[PDB]
Amino acid sequence: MNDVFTRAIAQADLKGSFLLESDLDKLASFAKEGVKRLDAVAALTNNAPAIISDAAHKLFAEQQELIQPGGNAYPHRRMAACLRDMEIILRYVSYALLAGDASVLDDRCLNGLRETYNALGTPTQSVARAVQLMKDAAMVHLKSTANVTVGDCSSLYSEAATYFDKAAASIA
Amino acid sequence: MNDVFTRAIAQADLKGSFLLESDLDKLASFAKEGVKRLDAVAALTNNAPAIISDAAHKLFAEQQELIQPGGNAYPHRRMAACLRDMEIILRYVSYALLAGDASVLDDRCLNGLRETYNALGTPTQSVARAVQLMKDAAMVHLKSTANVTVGDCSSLYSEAATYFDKAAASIA
Amino acid sequence: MNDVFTRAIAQADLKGSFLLESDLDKLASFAKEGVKRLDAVAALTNNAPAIISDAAHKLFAEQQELIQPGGNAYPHRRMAACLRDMEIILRYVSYALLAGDASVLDDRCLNGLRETYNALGTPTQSVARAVQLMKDAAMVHLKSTANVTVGDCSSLYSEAATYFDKAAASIA
Amino acid sequence: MNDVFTRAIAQADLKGSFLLESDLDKLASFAKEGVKRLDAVAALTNNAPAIISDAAHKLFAEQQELIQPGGNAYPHRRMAACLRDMEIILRYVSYALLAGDASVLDDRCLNGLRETYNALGTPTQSVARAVQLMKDAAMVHLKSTANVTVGDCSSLYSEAATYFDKAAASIA
Amino acid sequence: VTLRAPFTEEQFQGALYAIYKQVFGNTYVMESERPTTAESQLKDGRITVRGFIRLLAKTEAYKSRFLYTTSQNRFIELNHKLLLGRAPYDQAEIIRHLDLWNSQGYDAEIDSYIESEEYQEFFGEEVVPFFRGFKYQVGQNPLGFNGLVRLYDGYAGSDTERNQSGQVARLTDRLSRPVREQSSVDRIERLLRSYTS
Amino acid sequence: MSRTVITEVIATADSQGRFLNSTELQAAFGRFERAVPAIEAARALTKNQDALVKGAVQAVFKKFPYVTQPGEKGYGDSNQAKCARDIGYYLRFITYSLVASGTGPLDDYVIAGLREVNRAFNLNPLWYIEALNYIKGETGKLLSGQSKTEALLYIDHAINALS
Amino acid sequence: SRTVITEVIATADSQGRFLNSTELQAAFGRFERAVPAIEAARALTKNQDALVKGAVQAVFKKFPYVTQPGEKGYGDSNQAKCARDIGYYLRFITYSLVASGTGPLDDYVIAGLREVNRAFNLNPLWYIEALNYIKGETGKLLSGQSKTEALLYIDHAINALS
Amino acid sequence: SRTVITEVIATADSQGRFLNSTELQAAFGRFERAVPAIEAARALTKNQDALVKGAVQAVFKKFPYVTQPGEKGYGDSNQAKCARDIGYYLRFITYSLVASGTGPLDDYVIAGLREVNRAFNLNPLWYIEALNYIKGETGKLLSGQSKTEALLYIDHAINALS
Amino acid sequence: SRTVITEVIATADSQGRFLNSTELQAAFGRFERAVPAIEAARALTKNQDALVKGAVQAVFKKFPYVTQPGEKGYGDSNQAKCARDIGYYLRFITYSLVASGTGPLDDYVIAGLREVNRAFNLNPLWYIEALNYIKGETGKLLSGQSKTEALLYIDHAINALS
Ligand SMILES: CCC1=C(C)/C(=C/C2=NC(=C\c3[nH]c(/C=C4\NC(=O)[C@H](C)[C@H]4CC)c(C)c3CCC(=O)O)/C(CCC(=O)O)=C2C)NC1=O
Ligand SMILES: CCC1=C(C)/C(=C/C2=NC(=C\c3[nH]c(/C=C4\NC(=O)[C@H](C)[C@H]4CC)c(C)c3CCC(=O)O)/C(CCC(=O)O)=C2C)NC1=O
Ligand SMILES: CCC1=C(C)/C(=C/C2=NC(=C\c3[nH]c(/C=C4\NC(=O)[C@H](C)[C@H]4CC)c(C)c3CCC(=O)O)/C(CCC(=O)O)=C2C)NC1=O
Ligand SMILES: CCC1=C(C)/C(=C/C2=NC(=C\c3[nH]c(/C=C4\NC(=O)[C@H](C)[C@H]4CC)c(C)c3CCC(=O)O)/C(CCC(=O)O)=C2C)NC1=O
Ligand SMILES: CCC1=C(C)/C(=C/C2=NC(=C\c3[nH]c(/C=C4\NC(=O)[C@H](C)[C@H]4CC)c(C)c3CCC(=O)O)/C(CCC(=O)O)=C2C)NC1=O
Ligand SMILES: CCC1=C(C)/C(=C/C2=NC(=C\c3[nH]c(/C=C4\NC(=O)[C@H](C)[C@H]4CC)c(C)c3CCC(=O)O)/C(CCC(=O)O)=C2C)NC1=O
Ligand SMILES: CCC1=C(C)/C(=C/C2=NC(=C\c3[nH]c(/C=C4\NC(=O)[C@H](C)[C@H]4CC)c(C)c3CCC(=O)O)/C(CCC(=O)O)=C2C)NC1=O
Ligand SMILES: CCC1=C(C)/C(=C/C2=NC(=C\c3[nH]c(/C=C4\NC(=O)[C@H](C)[C@H]4CC)c(C)c3CCC(=O)O)/C(CCC(=O)O)=C2C)NC1=O
Ligand SMILES: CCC1=C(C)/C(=C/C2=NC(=C\c3[nH]c(/C=C4\NC(=O)[C@H](C)[C@H]4CC)c(C)c3CCC(=O)O)/C(CCC(=O)O)=C2C)NC1=O
Ligand SMILES: CCC1=C(C)/C(=C/C2=NC(=C\c3[nH]c(/C=C4\NC(=O)[C@H](C)[C@H]4CC)c(C)c3CCC(=O)O)/C(CCC(=O)O)=C2C)NC1=O
Ligand SMILES: CCC1=C(C)/C(=C/C2=NC(=C\c3[nH]c(/C=C4\NC(=O)[C@H](C)[C@H]4CC)c(C)c3CCC(=O)O)/C(CCC(=O)O)=C2C)NC1=O
């Protein structure tokens, strides 16, 4: 269960050395910028209903098979499973955003999710499309500058994009 | 597990179709001939020790190598285990007989059984023979016309023969 | 083509001066890392069939319309040409990695791919996705430490990533 | 988990026969010199911490890369894991020595040890070398003529040596 | 192993060792992690063995080993294998426990194991959990025994987080086919119909 | 794994590791004898599926005019069509539960994960309570005797689960 | 390990919910103290060699009986590896400073401490007073926030050894 | 109840351990947020008499059908209960704000929210949009740390209502 | 594509000559044997489902070891793609019958099959026993010359797979 500082510490310990000057420099830079990361995390947190609802709407509009009877999100319990899975993926994406590390996502939430979906007959491709629609809605919600000080967040935007892309690629 | 009622439901659902009139006809027939089915199930139930003891006697008559030292059923703990296994298979056959379909017998009993016996080293040919011997010793109790109204029940006799054959083929 | 040493000699000839001491320093830095370059290219070449196979697996999984009839992979000769394309693009990116100068990939490979796939009707976005999947599959064996002396090679990872990014943006 | 007596009983039972006279002679001879066996077990128990400490000191002097940063036994938790493994294995060798058969080892000590060590990345050769060092440290205590009656115990020495060798070969 | 009312100092340490060896697998527990306050609360009977096991399940050592590095399928399998002794039977259990987790927290998730009816009879207040799926337990599938056999790799082994594989799931593959592969035959025709388009 | 008195008795007997005792056979026979009214009600509903669905959607619009206006869920032609599809689903599972003489089909296929989908798609339960109240009012006249009682009971179960 | 951010993610993952406001407040306060902690890590990183040698000499001074032959301190390897141990402790304390949490200590020295101390017959008092001497040196090497920040981890490890 | 000090003491005492670095950080951080929270608490305590009326008029405007005869919002007693509900809401918002933790908020409105809402047919959307009105108006009522402190608590309340 | 008609027309075009006797006699041959070929193709199109699914079953029965969990043949998608591939093969055999030439087989499935097969570790045998199943059935569904020529084309299919 790792964040960026803990990965840095792990590397410094495998080498057996103290942390190097450049490492402390980049960690201090990350910590100073971290206030903006916290706002990105709060934007994901407070709006996740909206991201999930929009992603589900676009997903089932594109693939109306998953709502057909015999489709894999057909009954109310499977629709609930779909929404809950999307919400958990988004939760662990925001966890990775806070920690600035993909360890929590990859270990806790995606170590064996592909094999689970294959075992249950779930189309992993629709799962990946749900994740990508989630990332699009999350980008739109991160772009929002309401009640916050304007600034440049391209670092956080790229990290969120690569988090969602890692999620999609690990699923499928 | 599913009876034949919920088989009809599930096949109606996974094609998104209401239950047909013909399907309602077969299920109503199942319901009307249900009382004979209850008679058959009670015949299996109330005569369980008789069926099990007869099948065990025949089984240890045919192949003595089980009960002699170094045999699977020998050490008087494994004998109790053998009788308990036969009771379990009889119980699940009676469950499938009351239900109408082998979902109980093929899910709750027969999924992990063949390689369970492979793990234990138990011969499975002997277990399948034991199941067939129980089928023989249970048809005679199932056909007992005493203390009950008389009627044709070849349908249920074929049904129970199929369930015992199914268990014996799965286990072997 | 024009390797890294060829590049240095080219700029020296163009400005008409000798090698500066910093030029010799950076060329010596390239010379010393040549062992790491050998390790990287060996890893890529040995794992090449596996890498291209799994990459094509994720390719056809993500985009299921290419394989099916009417797609540019359907007639199964086009499949052979497709495999040839993946292997050749990985071959030239391995070449560029070995030389350390992206000139060979840009000239010998990427000069005409754009117009070529316009003339061939291939979805080029799909090909960019393909090469990105290549880098994703290859970085696995890249950070693999099996059978070799361990050591940080982050520059090699970044250079391989930049080579694949150049190829992707080219065919994009 | 079977002492000499219960192993003999199991063999007799498999042969469906009473215990032979020669086998009873073997068991009576075993139970006659059993006080020597008790002395050896009490020497492995009373002088256990010295054996673990000395074996660990020799092991970490001879093989230093374990305690280096990045080594397998580097942090405190992994040193404690080393000490507990060695104490457990000495404990199980004492158990086998008292019982008289390696049944306790192959039942409990060595049941899945190689699987555990191949999962943990531990070098099994190092653990085998540690068991060898425990052998050398323990033979000194077993051969301590002081505080006991003088008598030949070469059979116990060979038996305990075989137990330690079996533990090492199972770990290796 | 039990803990009666008049128990003494002896085997109380043994009871603790059995509890740790069961709950935490064979994974080592350095006394930097043993909760001394819980042991003292057990020593006067203010809490039963069931209460102490609830405490251990809710410590950060248990979570560190079984909740963070693992998925939720693996977490449910381990919770069964450790706090109950048996493997899970079907995705009915997995679905119930995962929904209970996401809706009511790890606290209620662990309570569903500890204050359950099954735990009440088989172990109860003063019995340390033991692997009991090897012997036929009433009302099980034939896959409960197979699952406990697959989870349990040996007396020496353990289900440890800190290994090469990263503590991946062992049994969802095993528990996988029966629950949701009855509709495989028709899903085949659906997939072919999609492919032919 | 749908629950039904047959399934319930088989499950409560497998749980205890025992054969089906007399009382479970009593319950099974009771279900078997009540099957005929339930199957009759199921076919009666199946014949008149479309009229009931159309009436239900019209009554939902009538008791909730505000949803119909634009800017709301009720707007949309295909939206309203698959509203009718949704009430068709509800009636379909009512008939399934009648055939099964148990709430298992209804429970599993609708009630399980009901409020979660209602929230995450902002679907008001009161819409569907209106629809099922209209279906109650209709089935009051179609069915009589035991079949009517069974239909009313299952509609009550679904409404209470929604409400 | 176990840091403030990691503890936030754990308490929001075990309870299976999003991050409430209070957890973000804790994160932002941690970000506020980040700069003093990393400055303390800088300062201790520079003076590593002198700190280690001074700690070793303080160990020899406080425990005179350790040095003579037939005892733990005798033999060049013994105090060389004493220096190794002291460098280990100092490195993990700087790690704690950088991570802004007691994680690396608890994972690399605390977890597994008493078993190794009692097996190899080491003494917690040696390292306790050596960390006291490191406290003395960091009293002057640092000032203000970084000073007490380093002191917090130093005496946390001391209480762990005590 | 639940404050930042609540998780401080709970996560410090669950392990039965003395108070280490991290919970001391959390206590200090909670202490520093206290005064902007108090300023915002004063600002939102002054405005309540008009805040409640603004909220009730916002509810009546958003849902035209609720106020018409035959519906929940119509009636003098119904609107009196609306006013009492909004006043209680704002009072517990101030309580959570001053306490620096949503503890009073959580155990006073969240505890028993969904079940009581379905019990008395309280549509959550009514209170969601009322709290949205309060959030929007407090956006101009407060600035700086106070604005964010109020807005995150309002967001927690509305997400609870969802 | 590649047909005896196309072979004639290309082997006349590349030499720029008008057609003479020999190739137009071959054209007579094609046009006379079209009818048996086309009715054979009709019959094969009439019975496809049994052919494909029983071929899949035959592959399982001849290779049980590919069915179990954990190997490549395992998987619902894997069975679906079985049926897909064998359907394609039946497709193209019918096409070749229609064209009265082995062309379309060569153009589509024979061109480059080796390296794509070893690309996914596909065993061509599996398809060979599928073809064996197919010849087993066409020994019954067809009669004489149509049967003979369908057997010829499928045999060529194995030979190319061989
Ligand atoms: C904590 C980390 C974690 C997660 C999140 C996880 C997800 C997960 N999804 C599951 C099944 C499922 N997953 C889905 C959702 C998919 N199907 C639809 O097509 C969608 C496109 C798509 C959602 C994006 C559905 C519908 C099921 C039910 C399958 C069935 O009942 O047959 C299951 C098994 C039963 C259950 O639903 O609880 C799990 C455990 N597993 C984990 O260890
Ligand atoms: C307690 C919970 C918490 C809150 C309420 C919070 C809001 C918050 N945002 C801040 C700065 C900032 N916040 C942002 C982020 C925003 N700007 C962009 O428009 C983005 C769209 C958007 C989010 C990605 C930026 C860019 C800054 C200024 C960067 C800096 O710190 O210098 C600050 C520091 C005030 C200052 O620098 O004077 C706070 C307190 N941060 C927190 O940890
Ligand atoms: C609910 C469904 C279910 C079934 C059916 C089932 C079968 C089953 N039988 C077992 C034992 C056994 N069963 C037998 C019986 C065999 N010996 C002879 O060959 C006979 C012909 C034959 C009996 C028909 C024996 C000998 C054992 C003990 C095996 C051993 O100790 O090596 C065991 C191992 C647990 C134990 O020790 O009791 C299982 C799991 N388990 C289940 O959960
Ligand atoms: C208390 C639990 C319970 C039982 C036991 C039960 C069985 C049962 N079977 C009946 C008639 C019957 N029972 C049987 C079955 C028998 N006839 C065949 O020849 C076989 C010997 C055998 C079945 C294999 C048949 C065929 C009928 C006539 C019903 C018909 O015409 O379909 C009747 C009506 C006659 C009466 O009440 O005396 C009952 C109640 N129903 C119950 O609620
Ligand atoms: C015949 C062609 C040839 C090969 C294949 C080759 C590999 C090679 N790499 C070496 C050292 C090395 N090799 C590597 C590269 C590897 N280590 C890193 O961790 C990565 C896993 C990976 C690169 C991505 C490194 C880092 C060293 C140590 C050299 C240094 O100090 O930087 C050595 C010297 C050690 C020995 O002989 O055992 C060889 C032979 N050299 C050759 O002449
Ligand atoms: C039946 C009784 C029993 C045995 C035998 C047993 C072996 C055992 N040793 C273990 C760890 C370990 N054991 C060692 C010690 C070895 N590595 C070094 O090379 C030393 C030289 C050598 C000691 C001889 C180490 C270093 C680990 C930790 C490895 C790791 O964390 O990756 C573990 C993993 C437990 C955990 O997660 O902490 C087990 C299960 N466990 C048991 O319950
Ligand atoms: C806790 C219960 C208990 C124990 C275990 C015990 C040990 C014990 N040691 C004995 C003597 C003895 N002990 C030994 C064994 C020693 N020979 C040496 O070379 C070895 C260092 C060592 C064994 C490896 C021998 C050889 C004897 C003399 C008796 C004989 O030869 O059988 C005797 C017999 C009395 C005697 O002749 O002195 C006992 C009972 N006494 C007890 O009340
Ligand atoms: C098998 C059981 C089952 C049911 C019942 C079910 C209901 C259901 N309602 C939905 C939303 C909806 N529900 C409605 C129905 C409303 N429209 C209003 O006019 C009426 C008041 C009311 C009908 C009474 C509408 C229009 C939507 C679409 C809203 C939108 O996407 O904009 C959706 C989302 C489908 C999509 O992607 O568009 C489903 C699946 N799902 C199930 O799996
Ligand atoms: C995680 C970091 C870590 C620590 C803390 C650690 C402690 C440690 N100290 C050891 C030996 C030792 N360490 C000392 C330290 C003493 N030297 C002087 O005399 C002082 C009085 C005193 C230190 C202040 C001594 C004397 C020994 C030798 C005693 C023995 O090996 O049993 C050993 C035995 C293995 C070896 O190093 O060869 C360990 C594991 N090991 C680690 O990997
Ligand atoms: C401890 C803090 C507290 C809360 C959170 C609270 C909410 C609350 N509102 C209630 C009733 C009510 N609440 C409302 C208000 C709603 N209906 C319409 O008028 C409006 C659109 C809307 C308000 C904007 C109404 C009309 C009732 C009457 C009962 C009912 O709705 O069935 C009730 C039932 C018991 C009662 O108070 O009389 C509670 C518990 N009450 C409290 O004491
Ligand atoms: C023009 C006609 C045509 C041919 C000849 C053809 C060959 C072919 N078969 C494929 C699917 C496949 N087909 C099989 C083999 C079948 N499935 C297994 O279960 C059985 C052992 C076996 C049936 C006997 C496999 C293993 C794949 C996909 C490879 C993979 O995903 O691992 C693929 C795509 C590979 C992929 O999706 O990964 C190709 C190119 N495709 C075509 O469109």
PDB file of C-alpha atoms in Angstrom, chain B residues 13-84:
ATOM      1  CA  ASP B  13     -36.841 -14.583 -19.243  1.00  0.00           C
ATOM      2  CA  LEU B  14     -33.500 -14.996 -21.010  1.00  0.00           C
ATOM      3  CA  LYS B  15     -35.465 -14.521 -24.230  1.00  0.00           C
ATOM      4  CA  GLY B  16     -37.481 -11.661 -22.739  1.00  0.00           C
ATOM      5  CA  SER B  17     -40.727 -13.475 -23.495  1.00  0.00           C
ATOM      6  CA  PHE B  18     -43.803 -14.071 -21.396  1.00  0.00           C
ATOM      7  CA  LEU B  19     -44.466 -17.709 -20.603  1.00  0.00           C
ATOM      8  CA  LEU B  20     -46.347 -19.256 -23.503  1.00  0.00           C
ATOM      9  CA  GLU B  21     -49.719 -20.929 -23.195  1.00  0.00           C
ATOM     10  CA  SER B  22     -48.131 -24.276 -24.056  1.00  0.00           C
ATOM     11  CA  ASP B  23     -45.520 -23.852 -21.323  1.00  0.00           C
ATOM     12  CA  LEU B  24     -48.299 -23.084 -18.868  1.00  0.00           C
ATOM     13  CA  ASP B  25     -49.898 -26.309 -20.101  1.00  0.00           C
ATOM     14  CA  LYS B  26     -46.839 -28.424 -19.316  1.00  0.00           C
ATOM     15  CA  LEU B  27     -46.416 -26.762 -15.933  1.00  0.00           C
ATOM     16  CA  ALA B  28     -50.094 -27.230 -15.038  1.00  0.00           C
ATOM     17  CA  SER B  29     -49.723 -30.895 -15.955  1.00  0.00           C
ATOM     18  CA  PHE B  30     -46.680 -30.993 -13.681  1.00  0.00           C
ATOM     19  CA  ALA B  31     -48.830 -29.529 -10.918  1.00  0.00           C
ATOM     20  CA  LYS B  32     -51.730 -31.962 -11.369  1.00  0.00           C
ATOM     21  CA  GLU B  33     -49.481 -35.039 -11.419  1.00  0.00           C
ATOM     22  CA  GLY B  34     -47.662 -33.467  -8.480  1.00  0.00           C
ATOM     23  CA  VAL B  35     -49.441 -35.565  -5.865  1.00  0.00           C
ATOM     24  CA  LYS B  36     -47.988 -38.753  -7.335  1.00  0.00           C
ATOM     25  CA  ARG B  37     -44.609 -37.002  -7.187  1.00  0.00           C
ATOM     26  CA  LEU B  38     -45.106 -36.344  -3.484  1.00  0.00           C
ATOM     27  CA  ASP B  39     -45.954 -40.024  -3.068  1.00  0.00           C
ATOM     28  CA  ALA B  40     -42.728 -41.033  -4.806  1.00  0.00           C
ATOM     29  CA  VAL B  41     -40.668 -38.615  -2.712  1.00  0.00           C
ATOM     30  CA  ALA B  42     -42.225 -39.885   0.512  1.00  0.00           C
ATOM     31  CA  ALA B  43     -41.523 -43.442  -0.641  1.00  0.00           C
ATOM     32  CA  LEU B  44     -37.856 -42.533  -1.055  1.00  0.00           C
ATOM     33  CA  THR B  45     -37.789 -40.720   2.288  1.00  0.00           C
ATOM     34  CA  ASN B  46     -39.553 -43.090   4.675  1.00  0.00           C
ATOM     35  CA  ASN B  47     -37.688 -46.116   3.273  1.00  0.00           C
ATOM     36  CA  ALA B  48     -34.227 -44.534   3.228  1.00  0.00           C
ATOM     37  CA  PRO B  49     -32.524 -46.873   5.755  1.00  0.00           C
ATOM     38  CA  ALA B  50     -33.916 -49.916   3.957  1.00  0.00           C
ATOM     39  CA  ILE B  51     -32.644 -48.760   0.562  1.00  0.00           C
ATOM     40  CA  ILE B  52     -29.241 -47.832   1.941  1.00  0.00           C
ATOM     41  CA  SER B  53     -28.794 -51.087   3.859  1.00  0.00           C
ATOM     42  CA  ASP B  54     -29.843 -53.212   0.875  1.00  0.00           C
ATOM     43  CA  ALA B  55     -27.520 -51.351  -1.482  1.00  0.00           C
ATOM     44  CA  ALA B  56     -24.650 -51.635   0.992  1.00  0.00           C
ATOM     45  CA  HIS B  57     -25.200 -55.367   1.476  1.00  0.00           C
ATOM     46  CA  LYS B  58     -25.177 -55.987  -2.262  1.00  0.00           C
ATOM     47  CA  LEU B  59     -22.179 -53.695  -2.748  1.00  0.00           C
ATOM     48  CA  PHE B  60     -19.989 -55.422  -0.173  1.00  0.00           C
ATOM     49  CA  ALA B  61     -21.178 -58.778  -1.486  1.00  0.00           C
ATOM     50  CA  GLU B  62     -20.018 -58.040  -5.038  1.00  0.00           C
ATOM     51  CA  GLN B  63     -16.566 -56.655  -4.202  1.00  0.00           C
ATOM     52  CA  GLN B  64     -15.341 -57.830  -0.816  1.00  0.00           C
ATOM     53  CA  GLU B  65     -12.068 -55.954  -1.338  1.00  0.00           C
ATOM     54  CA  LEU B  66     -13.586 -52.826   0.202  1.00  0.00           C
ATOM     55  CA  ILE B  67     -14.205 -54.340   3.620  1.00  0.00           C
ATOM     56  CA  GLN B  68     -11.050 -56.401   4.029  1.00  0.00           C
ATOM     57  CA  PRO B  69      -7.934 -54.780   5.519  1.00  0.00           C
ATOM     58  CA  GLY B  70      -6.339 -52.364   3.109  1.00  0.00           C
ATOM     59  CA  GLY B  71      -9.668 -51.638   1.441  1.00  0.00           C
ATOM     60  CA  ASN B  72     -11.378 -48.292   1.177  1.00  0.00           C
ATOM     61  CA  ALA B  73     -14.355 -49.093   3.405  1.00  0.00           C
ATOM     62  CA  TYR B  74     -12.373 -51.130   5.927  1.00  0.00           C
ATOM     63  CA  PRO B  75     -11.322 -49.317   9.075  1.00  0.00           C
ATOM     64  CA  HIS B  76     -14.893 -48.959  10.414  1.00  0.00           C
ATOM     65  CA  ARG B  77     -14.660 -45.163  10.165  1.00  0.00           C
ATOM     66  CA  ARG B  78     -14.633 -45.301   6.387  1.00  0.00           C
ATOM     67  CA  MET B  79     -17.593 -47.688   6.552  1.00  0.00           C
ATOM     68  CA  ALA B  80     -19.625 -45.022   8.330  1.00  0.00           C
ATOM     69  CA  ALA B  81     -18.340 -42.560   5.740  1.00  0.00           C
ATOM     70  CA  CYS B  82     -19.549 -44.839   2.932  1.00  0.00           C
ATOM     71  CA  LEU B  83     -23.018 -45.182   4.416  1.00  0.00           C
ATOM     72  CA  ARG B  84     -23.170 -41.427   4.996  1.00  0.00           C
TER      73      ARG B  84
END
